[PDB]
Amino acid sequence: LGFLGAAGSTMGAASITLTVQARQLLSHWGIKQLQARVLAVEHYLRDQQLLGIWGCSGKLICCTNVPWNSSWSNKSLDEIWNNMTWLQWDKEINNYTQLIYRLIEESQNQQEKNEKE
Amino acid sequence: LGFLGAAGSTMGAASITLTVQARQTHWGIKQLQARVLAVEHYLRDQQLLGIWGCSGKLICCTNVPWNSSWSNKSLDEIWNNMTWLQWDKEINNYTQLIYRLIEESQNQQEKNEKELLELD
Amino acid sequence: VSLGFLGAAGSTMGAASITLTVQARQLLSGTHWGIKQLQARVLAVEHYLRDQQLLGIWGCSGKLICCTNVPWNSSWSNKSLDEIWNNMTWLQWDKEINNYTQLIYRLIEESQNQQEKNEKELLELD
Amino acid sequence: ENLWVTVYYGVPVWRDADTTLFCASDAKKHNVWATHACVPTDPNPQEIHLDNVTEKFNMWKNNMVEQMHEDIISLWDQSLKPCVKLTPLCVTLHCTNVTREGLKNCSFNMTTELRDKRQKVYSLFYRLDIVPINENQGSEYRLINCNTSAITQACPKVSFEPIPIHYCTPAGFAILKCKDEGFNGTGLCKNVSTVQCTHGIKPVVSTQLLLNGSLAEKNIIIRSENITNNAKIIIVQLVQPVTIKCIRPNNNTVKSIRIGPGQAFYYTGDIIGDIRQAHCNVTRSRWNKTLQEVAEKLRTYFGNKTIIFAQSSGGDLEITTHSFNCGGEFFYCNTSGLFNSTWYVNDTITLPCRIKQIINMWQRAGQAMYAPPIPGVIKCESNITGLLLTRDGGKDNNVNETFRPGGSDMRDNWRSELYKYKVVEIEPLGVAPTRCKRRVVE
Amino acid sequence: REGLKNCSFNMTTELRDKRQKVYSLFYRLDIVPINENQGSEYRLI
Amino acid sequence: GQLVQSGAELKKPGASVKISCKTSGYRFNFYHINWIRQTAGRGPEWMGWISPYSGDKNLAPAFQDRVIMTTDTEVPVTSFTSTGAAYMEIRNLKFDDTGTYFCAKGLLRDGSSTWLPYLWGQGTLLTVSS
Ligand SMILES: *[C@@H]1O[C@H](CO)[C@@H](O[C@@H]2O[C@H](CO)[C@@H](O[C@@H]3O[C@H](CO[C@H]4O[C@H](CO)[C@@H](O)[C@H](O[C@H]5O[C@H](CO)[C@@H](O)[C@H](O)[C@@H]5O)[C@@H]4O)[C@@H](O)[C@H](O[C@H]4O[C@H](CO)[C@@H](O)[C@H](O)[C@@H]4O)[C@@H]3O)[C@H](O)[C@H]2NC(C)=O)[C@H](O)[C@H]1NC(C)=O
Ligand SMILES: *[C@@H]1O[C@H](CO)[C@@H](O[C@@H]2O[C@H](CO)[C@@H](O[C@@H]3O[C@H](CO)[C@@H](O)[C@H](O[C@H]4O[C@H](CO)[C@@H](O)[C@H](O)[C@@H]4O[C@H]4O[C@H](CO)[C@@H](O)[C@H](O)[C@@H]4O)[C@@H]3O)[C@H](O)[C@H]2NC(C)=O)[C@H](O)[C@H]1NC(C)=O
Ligand SMILES: *[C@@H]1O[C@H](CO)[C@@H](O[C@@H]2O[C@H](CO)[C@@H](O[C@@H]3O[C@H](CO[C@H]4O[C@H](CO)[C@@H](O)[C@H](O)[C@@H]4O)[C@@H](O)[C@H](O[C@H]4O[C@H](CO)[C@@H](O)[C@H](O)[C@@H]4O)[C@@H]3O)[C@H](O)[C@H]2NC(C)=O)[C@H](O)[C@H]1NC(C)=O
Ligand SMILES: *[C@@H]1O[C@H](CO)[C@@H](O[C@@H]2O[C@H](CO)[C@@H](O[C@@H]3O[C@H](CO)[C@@H](O)[C@H](O)[C@@H]3O)[C@H](O)[C@H]2NC(C)=O)[C@H](O)[C@H]1NC(C)=O
Ligand SMILES: *[C@@H]1O[C@H](CO)[C@@H](O[C@@H]2O[C@H](CO)[C@@H](O[C@@H]3O[C@H](CO)[C@@H](O)[C@H](O)[C@@H]3O)[C@H](O)[C@H]2NC(C)=O)[C@H](O)[C@H]1NC(C)=O
Ligand SMILES: *[C@@H]1O[C@H](CO)[C@@H](O[C@@H]2O[C@H](CO)[C@@H](O)[C@H](O)[C@H]2NC(C)=O)[C@H](O)[C@H]1NC(C)=O
Ligand SMILES: *[C@@H]1O[C@H](CO)[C@@H](O[C@@H]2O[C@H](CO)[C@@H](O)[C@H](O)[C@H]2NC(C)=O)[C@H](O)[C@H]1NC(C)=O
Ligand SMILES: *[C@@H]1O[C@H](CO)[C@@H](O[C@@H]2O[C@H](CO)[C@@H](O)[C@H](O)[C@H]2NC(C)=O)[C@H](O)[C@H]1NC(C)=O
Ligand SMILES: *[C@@H]1O[C@H](CO)[C@@H](O[C@@H]2O[C@H](CO)[C@@H](O)[C@H](O)[C@H]2NC(C)=O)[C@H](O)[C@H]1NC(C)=O
Ligand SMILES: *[C@@H]1O[C@H](CO)[C@@H](O[C@@H]2O[C@H](CO)[C@@H](O)[C@H](O)[C@H]2NC(C)=O)[C@H](O)[C@H]1NC(C)=O
Ligand SMILES: *[C@@H]1O[C@H](CO)[C@@H](O[C@@H]2O[C@H](CO)[C@@H](O)[C@H](O)[C@H]2NC(C)=O)[C@H](O)[C@H]1NC(C)=O
Ligand SMILES: *[C@@H]1O[C@H](CO)[C@@H](O[C@@H]2O[C@H](CO)[C@@H](O)[C@H](O)[C@H]2NC(C)=O)[C@H](O)[C@H]1NC(C)=O
Ligand SMILES: *[C@@H]1O[C@H](CO[C@@H]2O[C@@H](C)[C@@H](O)[C@@H](O)[C@@H]2O)[C@@H](O)[C@H](O)[C@H]1NC(C)=O
Ligand SMILES: *[C@@H]1O[C@H](CO)[C@@H](O)[C@H](O)[C@H]1NC(C)=O
Ligand SMILES: *[C@@H]1O[C@H](CO)[C@@H](O)[C@H](O)[C@H]1NC(C)=O
Ligand SMILES: *[C@@H]1O[C@H](CO)[C@@H](O)[C@H](O)[C@H]1NC(C)=O
Ligand SMILES: *[C@@H]1O[C@H](CO)[C@@H](O)[C@H](O)[C@H]1NC(C)=O
Ligand SMILES: *[C@@H]1O[C@H](CO)[C@@H](O)[C@H](O)[C@H]1NC(C)=O
Ligand SMILES: *[C@@H]1O[C@H](CO)[C@@H](O)[C@H](O)[C@H]1NC(C)=O
Ligand SMILES: *[C@@H]1O[C@H](CO)[C@@H](O)[C@H](O)[C@H]1NC(C)=O
Ligand SMILES: *[C@@H]1O[C@H](CO)[C@@H](O)[C@H](O)[C@H]1NC(C)=O
C-alpha cells in the first residue's frame, strides 16, 4: 500500500487502490510559494473538470458509451488487466489519449441532448 | 454556434447551447492573480450547484414552486419572447431569494430520503 | 427563520441537520495589504477543496447527507442514537471521536472503491 | 398549471466588470516591455459573432485604458532598477560652444573607480538638457534634472522598440468587441463579437500624432466625449496612413567612462562631419488631402463653419511639440508646418526637430531618465495613423472654428486602440419556471 | 531652558562641488555633544 | 452530573418553606429541573418542572396555587459544564404535605421525553408539626 505502492501492480490489482492516489492530490518567496499552491489546485481541478465534462464526476470508475477501437490496441482484456501495469498501458496508448478524451466528450454531448427530451 | 453565441436568441432556443457555454516579473504577478480569479469563479458556481444537488447537470429541476410575484409571465412569454439577459433583469431582486428556497428544499429532501432508508 | 451562520452550533445534532446548507454556503465567500489578500483568497480555496476532495472520493459529492456501507464500531462510541442525536452538539461529538476521524475516513474510502468495482462487474455480466 | 423553479448552467448572461488582465504575445537587445514573460498566443485566435446583440460601449469610461497605463509605467520603472544611477553626474559644468547653438561642449569632474580620484570629462550635451547657473558669466551650467530629480541611465542593452501586446481575460470573463464599420467609441454598437484577447496593441508613445496604429476601414472617424465642450480631446482616426520619415544626420561618436565599481556612463565625445539639425519629412500632397478630409468630417458637427487648423498656443515642450522614440533617441518635433491651414469648402513638408537625453515621459515629478547616445546616423519611418486635437472655445463668432494639436493626458493614446473593447463578467447560473418537477425517492 | 539650540552646519547641495551653510533650530533631545566636551560642538543622536 | 438539596427542617402548619437544589457537572441551562414529592399516604407525585433556559414552568394542577419555582443564573466551569441552582417555594404547608422532596435533572435536550427526571438528588425530609 501507500502512495503509488500499486504502480508496479497489474492494472486489475491496482484498481483496488484508486482512492489511495485520489487523495493527497491536494496537500519574493511569498510569490513562489503561492504559485506552487495554485498549481496544485489547478491540476486537481483540471482533472475534475474533465470528469464533469465526461459525466463521470463523483466516480472513481466510470463506464462510457464510447466503443474501443481495435487500432488503439488489439490486446485482450485478460492480457491488459492481468499482464500489464498502468504505467505500461499509458505508453501503449499515449498517442491516442487525446483522441479518446474527445470522443468521450462528444458522447456526453449526445447524451445531454437525449436527457432534455 | 459558439461561446455566448446564443445570447441574442430566446431563452428556449439558448437551451441547446448550454453544453458549449458550460466549458471555459510584473506580468508574472498579474498572471498569478488571473489564475486565482479564474479558479474562484469556477468554484463559486460549482459550490451552489453542489448545495442545490444539481451538480453534474446542465439543467436541474427543483421542487420549489414558482411565485407569481417574481414574475406573472406565462411560460410562452418567458421562454419564447425573451433573452436570458432580459430575464436576468426581471428577477434581479428575487434571485437570492430563489437560491435560498432551493437550498432549503434540498436539505428537506435529503433528510426525508435518509428517513426512508432508515425504515428499510 | 434562519439562525444564521453557526447559529445551530449550540443546537443538538438532530436539530443542526436542518441548517447544513447555511454552513455549506459561504465557505468560499465568508503592497503589504495586497499580498495578504491574495494569500487569504488562495487559502479559502484550498480549505473548500480539501473537504470536497474527500466527498468526491467517498461518492458523497453533491449531497449534504450521505449514507455509507461502513458499520459503526462500538469502540468509537458506545452511545445510543438518542444519546447522540438528541443530547449532543456537533462540537461535543467531534471531540468524542476525534481520534477516530481519520480511521473512519479510510474505511469509507475503501468501501466506496469496492462498491464501484462491484458495480462495474454487475454491468459486465449483463 | 403548477410551475416550478428550474436551474440552468451555461446561461449566456453577462454584466460589466473590472478585471485583472494579463498579456499574451507571439512566440519569438532585451525589450523594455518584458514581453518574454507573456503567455504564448493561440496560433488561431477564436472570435464569436453575436447575432441579435446590441451593446453599449463607452471608450471614455473604459477601465482597460487605465489598467494599460499602469502596466506601461510599471514596466518602464522596472527596466531602470538594475541600471546605472548617475548620481555623480549632477555637478557644475563649464561649457563652451562646439568647435544653431543646439549643442555645447562641457567639462566636468566625473567620479572614478576609486573614491579618491576624479577625472575631467569632456562631452557634448544638447542645450535642452542644460540650465545655466545665474552667476551671469554664461560659462557655468547644470543639468536640468538637478533641481527636480535623481536621474537614471537607461541600460544600453535594453531596447525601447514597441512589441504588440495582446490583452487577455481570465476564464469566467470575456471581452466584447465592436465590429461596426464606423464607430465613434460611444453609444450602442450593432455588430458585437466575443474574443478571449484583444488584437495586439503596440505601446507607442507620442504627444500630438498617433503613430503606427490601426486604420479606419472606410471613413475618417472623429471621437470625443463631447464635441461641444472644447476642453475635451478629439481623437481622429485616419483611413490611410501618412508616412513620416525622420533622420538625425549627425554621426555621433560615443565614448564611455567608469564612474564607480560596476558602473559606466555613456556620452557623445564628438560629432564627425558637419553638425546638422534633426528633421522629419511629411509628404505635402498626402497631408493636404488628409487635412481636407478631416476638415470635411469636423465640419458636420459645427454647422458648416470654416475650419482653421493652428499650432499649439504654448506651454511645456512635451505638449507643444510632437514626441517619439526613434532608434532609442527621443525626438521633439515642431508641427506648425503641418497644422497651419484653413479650409473654406470651395513636394514635402520638412519639420525641424530637437533631441533630449533627459526625459520624463509620464510627467512625474521626482523622476527622470538619461538616455545614452546612439552612435552613427539614426533613421526611421513611421505611419501617422491619427490626430489628437483640441478646440478654442469662449468665442461666439460663428464664422469659423480653430483646432490645435496635442493634449496633456497620455492615456488618450491607448484609447485609440481600446475604444472597441469592453470587459464583461460571465454569469453561467440562472433560474426560470418550467412545468418540470424534480423526482424524489418514493 | 535648553529645550532648543540654534545649530549651524555645511550641508550638501544639488551639485556635488557646492556646499551651503544652514542655520536651524533643533530640540535638545535630538542633540548629542561631541565627546571632546568643548560644549560648542554637537552631533545628531 | 450531581444534584444536592437543602437539609431537612421542621415547620409549623401554614409556614412557608424554600428548598434549594444546587447542581454541578453538566450544563444547567440545557435541561429541565423537575420537582417530585413522595409521601406515605400518596406515593410519588409531580410538582411540575421549570426550564432554566426560558424560565418557563409547567406546574401540576394540584400545586399551582401553592408552589413557586425559580432558578439562578448558571456559572460556567468548562465549555460544556456549569454550576447553578434551582429553588422551590411551598406556601401554606399542611400535615398532608409531610414527606420527602426530590430535585431531578431532565433527560434530553431534544426528542419526546426531554423533561424526564434522569438524575435524582438524595432528597430531604420535610416535617410539619404544631
Ligand atoms: C438551547 O438549549 C435549550 C435547552 O436544551 C434548547 O431547548 C430545547 O429545544 C427543544 C426543541 O425541540 C425542546 O424540545 C421540545 O420540548 C417540548 C417540551 O414542552 C415544553 O416546551 C414548550 C415550548 O414551547 C412549551 O410550550 C411546553 O409548555 C407549555 O405547553 C404545555 C402543553 O400545553 C403546558 O402543559 C405548559 O404548562 C406550557 O403552557 C413545555 O414547557 C416538547 O413539547 C416538544 O415536542 C415536540 O417536538 C419533538 C421534537 O421534534 C417531537 O418529538 C414531539 O413529538 C413534539 O412534536 C419538544 O420535545 C426542548 O424541550 C428544549 N429544552 C428545554 C430545556 O427547554 C434550545 O432549543 C437550544 N437552542 C439552540 C439555538 O440550539
Ligand atoms: C513605426 O514602425 C516602423 C516599422 O516597424 C518602425 O521602424 C522600424 O524600426 C526598427 C527598430 O528600430 C528598425 O530596425 C532597425 O534598423 C536599424 C537600422 O540602423 C538597426 O540598427 C536596428 O538594429 C539595431 O538596433 C536594435 C534595437 O533593438 C538591436 O536589437 C539590434 O541588435 C541592432 O543594434 C546592434 O547593432 C547595431 C548595428 O549598427 C549597433 O549600432 C548597436 O549598438 C547594436 O550592437 C534595427 O534592425 C527598422 O529599420 C525600422 N523601419 C523603417 C522602415 O525605418 C518605427 O520605429 C516605428 N515608430 C515608432 C515611433 O515606434
Ligand atoms: C575639478 O575640481 C577642481 C577642484 O574644485 C577644480 O580646480 C579648481 O578650479 C578653480 C577654478 O575653477 C580654482 O579656483 C580658484 O582658486 C583661487 C584660490 O582660492 C582661494 O580661496 C580658497 C578658498 O575659497 C583657498 O582654499 C585658496 O587657498 C585660495 O586662498 C581663487 O583665488 C580663484 O578666484 C578667482 O576665480 C573665481 C572663478 O569663479 C572668481 O570667482 C574669483 O573672483 C577670482 O577671480 C579661484 O576660485 C581652484 O583653486 C581649483 N582647485 C584646486 C584644488 O586646484 C577643477 O577646475 C575641476 N575640473 C573641472 C573640469 O571642472
Ligand atoms: C510484483 O510482481 C510480482 C510478479 O509479477 C507479482 O506476483 C504475482 O502476485 C499475484 C498476487 O498479487 C499472484 O497472483 C496469484 O497467483 C496464484 C497462482 O500462483 C493464483 O492462485 C491466485 O489466484 C493469484 O492470481 C501471482 O501468482 C504472482 N506472480 C508470480 C509470478 O509469483 C506481485 O504481486 C507484484 N506485487 C504487487 C504489489 O503488485
Ligand atoms: C527631407 O527632405 C529634405 C528636402 O527634400 C531632404 O534633403 C535632401 O537630401 C538629399 C540627400 O542628402 C540631398 O541630396 C544630396 O545633396 C548632396 C549635397 O552635397 C549631394 O552631394 C548629393 O549628391 C545629393 O544631391 C538634397 O540636396 C536635399 N535637399 C535639400 C533641399 O536640401 C532630406 O533628405 C529628407 N529626409 C529624408 C529622411 O528623406
Ligand atoms: C528648475 O530650474 C528651472 C530653470 O531655472 C526652473 O524653471 C522655471 O521655473 C519657474 C517656476 O519656478 C517657471 O515659472 C519658469 O517658466 C521655468 N522656466 C522654464 C524655462 O521652464 C524650474 O522651476 C526649477 N524647478 C524647481 C522645482 O524649482
Ligand atoms: C505604413 O503604411 C504602408 C502603406 O503606406 C504599409 O505598407 C503597405 O501595407 C499594405 C497592407 O499590409 C501592403 O499591401 C503594402 O504592400 C505595403 N507596402 C509596402 C511598400 O511594403 C506599412 O505596413 C505601414 N506600416 C505600419 C507599421 O503599419
Ligand atoms: C457618437 O454616436 C452617438 C450615437 O449616435 C452620439 O450620441 C447621441 O448624440 C445625439 C446628438 O444629437 C444626441 O441627441 C443623443 O442623445 C446621443 N445619444 C446618447 C445615448 O447619448 C454621440 O454624440 C456621438 N459622438 C460624437 C463625438 O459625435
Ligand atoms: C457638452 O458640452 C456642453 C458645453 O460644456 C454642455 O452644455 C453646456 O452646459 C452648461 C451647464 O452645464 C451651460 O451653462 C452651457 O450654456 C451649455 N452650453 C451650450 C452650448 O449649451 C453640454 O451639456 C454637454 N453635453 C453633455 C451630454 O454633457
Ligand atoms: C561615422 O563615422 C565613423 C568614423 O569615421 C565611420 O566608420 C569608420 O569608417 C572608416 C572608413 O570607412 C572605417 O575605416 C572605420 O573602421 C569605421 N569605424 C567603425 C567603428 O566602423 C562610420 O561609417 C560613419 N557613419 C556613417 C553613417 O557615415
Ligand atoms: C514651432 O515653430 C514655429 C515657427 O517657427 C514657432 O513660431 C515662432 O516662434 C518664434 C519664437 O522666437 C517667434 O519669433 C516667431 O515669430 C514665431 N512664428 C510665428 C509665425 O508665430 C513656434 O514657437 C515653434 N514652437 C516651439 C514650441 O518651439
Ligand atoms: C475667424 O474668426 C475670428 C473670430 O473668432 C475672426 O477674428 C476677427 O478678425 C478681425 C479681422 O477680420 C479682427 O479685426 C478681429 O479683432 C478678430 N477677432 C478676434 C476675436 O480675434 C477672424 O477674422 C475669422 N476669420 C475669417 C477668415 O473670417
Ligand atoms: C445527556 O447528557 C448528560 C450530560 O452528559 C454529557 O453528555 C452526554 C451525551 C455524554 O457525552 C456525557 O459523557 C457528557 O458528560 C447526561 O447527564 C444525561 O444522562 C444524558 N441523557 C441521556 C438520556 O443519556
Ligand atoms: C409568494 O410570495 C409571497 C411573499 O410575500 C408570499 O406571501 C406568498 O405566499 C407566495 N406564494 C406562494 C404560492 O408561495
Ligand atoms: C428591482 O430593484 C430595482 C432598484 O434596486 C428597481 O429599479 C427594479 O425595477 C426592481 N425590479 C423589479 C422587477 O421590481
Ligand atoms: C471494531 O474496532 C476494533 C478495534 O477497537 C477492531 O478490531 C474491529 O475489527 C472493529 N470492527 C469492525 C467491524 O470494523
Ligand atoms: C485521544 O487519544 C489521546 C491519547 O493519544 C487521549 O488522551 C484522548 O483522551 C483521546 N481522545 C478521546 C476522545 O478518546
Ligand atoms: C556661442 O555662439 C553664440 C553666437 O552664435 C555666442 O553668442 C555665444 O556667446 C557663444 N557661446 C560661448 C560659450 O562662447
Ligand atoms: C571639446 O573640448 C575638448 C577640449 O578642448 C576637445 O578635446 C574636444 O574635442 C571638444 N569636442 C568637440 C566636439 O569639439
Ligand atoms: C501658413 O499658411 C499660409 C497660407 O495659408 C502661408 O502663407 C504661411 O507661410 C504658412 N506658414 C508657415 C509657417 O508655413
Ligand atoms: C562651514 O564652512 C566654513 C568655510 O569657511 C567654515 O568656516 C565653517 O566652520 C564650516 N562650518 C562647520 C560647522 O564646519
3-state per-residue secondary structure call for chain F: CEEEECCCEEECCCCCEEEEEEEEEECHHHCCEEEEEEECCCEEEEEEEECCCCCCEECCCCCCCCEEEEECCCEEEECCEEEEEEEEEECCCCHHHCEEEEEEEECCCCCCCCCCEEEECCCEEEEECC
The nearest CA of chain C is from the CA of B90 a distance in Å of: 25
Phi, then psi, of F90 in degrees rounded to 5: -115, 130
Say yes or no: CB of residue D91 within 6 Å of ligand 10: no
Q: Which one of E14, E17, E18 has the shortest CB-CB distance to D147?
A: E14
Q: How far is A92 from chain B (nearest CA, A)?
A: 29
Question: In this structure, which amino acid lies at residue C70?
Answer: V
Question: Which position has the grid cell 451562520?
Answer: C5
DSSP one-letter code for D197: B
Amino acid D228 reads: T
Q: Atom 11, ligand 17: which residue's CA is nearest?
A: C99
| Residues of chain B neighbouring A57 (CB-CB closer than 8 A) | 55-56
CB contact under 8 Å between E17 and D109, yes or no, is yes
Return the HEC string of chain A. Answer: CCCCCCCCCCHHHHHHHHHHHHCCCCCCHHHHHHHHHHHHHHHHHHHHHHHHHHCCCCCCCCCCCCCCCCCCCCCCHHHHHHHCCHHHHHHHCCCCHHHHHHHHHHHHHHHHHHHCC
Subunits next to A (3 or more Cβ pairs <8 Å) are B, C
* Residue D345 DSSP class: -
How close is the Cα of A10 to the center of ligand 4, in Å?
Answer: 9
**Helix (H) / strand (E) containing B2:** none
Identify whether the C-beta of residue A116 lies closer than 8 Å to the C-beta of residue B59.
Answer: yes
Smallest Cα–Cα separation from F32: which of F75, F3, F61? F3
Q: Cell numbers 500632397 correspond to what residue?
A: D285
Q: In this complex, which of B15, B35, B56 lies closest to A38 when CB atoms are compared? A: B35
Burial class (CB in 10 A: 0-12, 13-18, 19+), B116: exposed
Euclidean distance between CA atoms D74 and D70, whole angstroms: 6
**Positive or negative: CA dihedral A40, A45, A50, A55:** positive
Ligand nearest to the CA of D298: 8
| Least distant ligand from the CA of D161 | 2
Q: Under a CB-based contact definition with an 8 Å cutoff, are residues F79 and F26 in contact?
A: no
The grid coordinates listed for C44 are 479559502
DSSP per position, D293-312: HHHHHHGGGTTSPEEEE---
Q: Are A104 and A57 in contact (CB under 8 A)?
A: no
- Residue D173, C-beta contacts closer than 8 angstroms, at least 6 positions apart: B41, D17, D19, D423, D424, D425, D426
Method: cryo-EM
> Of all helices (H) and strands (E), which one includes residue B76?
helix B75-79
Strand F75-78 vs strand F67-71: parallel, antiparallel, or unpaired? unpaired
By the 8 A CB rule, do A15 and A61 touch? yes
CB-nearest to A45 from B16, B39, B59 is B39
Please name the member of C45, C57, C123 whose beta carbon is closest to the beta carbon of A19: C57
Q: Which residue has the cell 491540476?
A: A43
Strand partners, D175: D195, D423
> D332 and D355 in contact (C-beta within 8 Å)?
yes
The residues spanned by each domain of chain F are: 1-130
From B50's Cα to the closest Cα of chain D, the distance in A is: 12
3-state secondary structure of B69: coil
3-state per-residue secondary structure call for E1-45:
CCCEEEEEEEEECCCCCCEEEEEEEEEHHHEEECCCCCCCCEEEC
Q: Is any atom of ligand 4 closer than 6 Å to the C-beta of A8? A: yes
Length of chain A: 117
Report yes or no: D274 at the B interface, CB cutoff 8 Å. no
List of residues 6+ apart from F91 with CB closer than 8 A: F16, F66, F67, F68
Query: Which sign does the torsion angle of CA A61, A66, A70, A76 carry?
Result: positive
Q: Give the closest ligand to the alpha carbon of residue D394.
A: 12
The residue whose CA has the least distance to atom 2 of ligand 17 is: C99
Q: How far apart are CA D347 and CA D283, in angstroms?
A: 6
Q: Nearest-CA distance from A109 to chain C in Å?
A: 21
Q: Do B35 and A42 touch (CB under 8 A)?
A: yes
CA D22 to chain centre: 20
Nearest residue of chain D to residue E12 (CA atoms): D91
**Number of neighbouring beta carbons within 10 Å of residue F68:** 16
Q: How far is CA D75 from the centre of its chain?
A: 14
Q: How far is the CA of D268 from the centre of ligand 19 (A)?
A: 11
Q: Which residues of A touch B22 (CB under 8 A)?
A: 53
AA identity, residue D338: L
Which of B1, B15, B20, B23 to mutate to test binding with chain A, by most A CBs within 10 Å of its CB? B23
> Measured between CA atoms, how close is A69 to chain C, in angstroms?
18
Return d(Cα D174, Cα D152) in angstroms, integer.
40
CB of D137 closer than 6 angstroms to any ligand 18 atom: no
Neighbours of D12 (CB within 10 A): 28
Return the C-alpha torsion angle B117, C3, C8, C13, nearest 10.
-30
Answer whether C82 touches F (CB < 8 Å).
Answer: yes
Pairwise CA distance, residues B48 & D431, whole Å: 12
* Residue bearing the CA closest to ligand 21, atom 6: E10
Please give the backbone phi and psi of residue D251, each rounded to the nearest 5 degrees, phi first.
Answer: -95, 85
Q: Least CB-CB distance to A26: which of C38, C53, C59?
A: C53
Name the residue of D94, D97, D106, D140 whose CB sits within 8 Å of the most ligand 18 atoms, as the mutation to test its pocket: D97
Quote the CA–CA distance of D131 and D125 in Å, as a whole number: 11
Q: What residues contact residue D96 under an 8 Å CB cut-off, 6+ apart? A: D104, D105, D106, D139
DSSP C102: H
- Range F1-130 classified under CATH 2.60.40.10: yes
Q: What is the resolution of this structure in A?
A: 3.3
Q: Is the CB of D251 under 6 A from ligand 10?
A: yes
Check: CB of residue D64 under 8 Å from CB of residue D167: yes
Instruction: Fill in the DSSP letter of residue D165.
Output: B
Q: Is the dihedral of CA E24, E30, E34, E40 positive or negative?
A: positive
Q: Provide the terminal-to-terminal Cα distance of chain D, rounded to the nearest Å.
A: 23
Q: Which one, of D279, D290, D234, D285, lies nearest residue D404 by Cα? A: D234
CA pair distance C50, C48, nearest whole angstrom: 6
Chain F neighbours, 3+ Cβ pairs < 8 A: C
| Cell numbers for D265 | 556612463
Q: What gap in Å lies between CA D420 and CA D415, rounded to an integer?
A: 9
Question: Which residue in F124, C45, B113 sits closest to D441, CA to CA?
Answer: B113
Residue D283: strand, helix, or coil: strand
Task: Find the farthest-apart pair of alpha carbons in chain D and give their distance in angstroms, rounded.
Answer: 105
Spatial distance between the Cα atoms of A88 and A80, rounded to a whole number of angstroms = 10
Cell of A52: 464533469
- The answer to whether residue D134 neighbours chain E at the CB level (below 8 Å) is no
CA angle D256, D261, D263 (to 5 degrees): 40
Question: Using CA atoms, how far apart are residues A27 and A36, in angstroms rounded to an integer?
Answer: 11
CB D213 within 8 A of CB D416: yes
Residue of D7, D35, D36, D64 for testing the chain B interface, max B β-carbons within 10 Å = D7
Contact present, F20 and F87 (Cβ < 8 Å): yes
Bridge partners, F102 (sequence order): F36
- Using a CB-CB cut-off of 8 Å, the residues of chain A touching C109 are 19, 23
Grid cell 571632546 is found at E36
**Calpha distance F24→F76 (Å, rounded):** 10
Contacts of residue A72, Cβ cutoff 8 Å, sequence gap at least 6: A93, A96, A100
Phi, psi of B6 (to 5 degrees): -85, -5
Question: Mutation test of the interface with chain A: which of B15, B35, B79, choosing the one with the most A Cβ atoms within 10 A?
Answer: B35
Q: Mark out chain C residues that contact chain A at CB-CB < 8 A.
A: 35, 38-39, 42, 45-46, 49-50, 53-54, 56-57, 59, 61-62, 109-110, 112-114, 116-117, 119-120, 123
Q: Which of C11, C82, C88 to mutate to test the interface with F (most CBs of F within 10 A)?
A: C82
* Nine cell digits for residue F49: 418542572
Backbone angles phi, psi at A89, to 5 degrees: -65, -40
Closest protein CA for atom 8 of ligand 14: B67
Calpha distance D259→A72 (Å, rounded) = 69
From residue A117, give the alpha-carbon distance in Å to each of A113, B7, B59, D420, D440: 7, 22, 12, 41, 19
| CA quadruple C81, C86, C87, C88: dihedral, nearest 10 | 90
Residues facing residue F85 across a β-bridge? F22
Strand D151-153's sheet: what is its strand order? D151-153, D368-370, D358-359
Q: Do C62 and A58 touch (CB under 8 A)?
A: yes
Tell how far the Cα of D393 is from the centroid of ligand 7, in angstroms.
38
Is D441 close to B116, i.e. CB distance below 8 A? Answer: yes
Q: Mind giving me the DSSP string for D348-415?
A: EEEEEEEEESEE-TT--TT-EEEPPP--EEEEEEEEEEEEEEEE--S----SEEEEEE--S-TTHHHH
Separation CA D109–CA D122 (nearest Å):
9
Return the axis-axis angle of helices B95-118 and B26-52, rounded to nearest 10°. Answer: 50
Quick one: which of D278, D269, D266, D273 has its CA closest to D251? D273
